[PDB]
């Protein structure tokens, strides 16, 4: 066991669960960890798959043990990287308080 391998993982009290909606078909959490591991250590990675059919819907939930880790990987991947087979870049947002979300553009 390396980098831990003791028991259950520990996250931050103010952590953030990021959500990706640019996951093609044929890959898995094992192919996403590599990239997410470029910013820091992951806490949890689950892929969303249909039920009736069970076919990879095309999205997954990524969680970071630290707050910053998310901020970086988020603003570092969000419309920055382009997975293989995806004409468009990868979309990653802080899966939280979706109901009400305030945001606005800014020059510069």
UniProtKB/Swiss-Prot annotation:
Tissue specificity annotation: Expressed mainly in kidney, brain and testis and present in other tissues albeit at lower levels. Also expressed in fetal kidney.
Would you tell me the protein name for this molecule?
CUGBP Elav-like family member 6
Function, please? RNA-binding protein implicated in the regulation of pre-mRNA alternative splicing. Mediates exon inclusion and/or exclusion in pre-mRNA that are subject to tissue-specific and developmentally regulated alternative splicing. Specifically activates exon 5 inclusion of TNNT2 in a muscle-specific splicing enhancer (MSE)-dependent manner. Promotes also exon exclusion of INSR pre-mRNA.
Q: Tell me where it resides.
A: Nucleus; Cytoplasm
Q: Which residues of the full protein are shown?
A: 38 to 132 of 481
RRM domain spans which residues?
16-97
Which family is annotated?
Belongs to the CELF/BRUNOL family.
Coiled coil location? none
């Amino acid at each position: 066991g390396s980098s831990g391998s003791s028991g259950v993982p520990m996250k931050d009290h103010d952590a953030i669960k990021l959500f990706v909606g640019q996951i093609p078909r044929g890959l898995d959490e094992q192919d996403l960890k590599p990239l997410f591991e470029e910013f820091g250590r992951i806490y949890e990675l689950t892929v969303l798959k249909d039920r009736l059919t069970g076919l990879h819907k095309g999205c997954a939930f990524l969680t970071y043990c630290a707050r910053d880790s998310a901020l970086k990987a988020q603003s570092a991947l969000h419309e920055q990287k382009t997975l293989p087979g995806m004409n468009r870049p990868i979309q990653v947002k802080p899966a939280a308080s979706e109901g009400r979300g305030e945001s606005g553009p800014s020059s510069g």
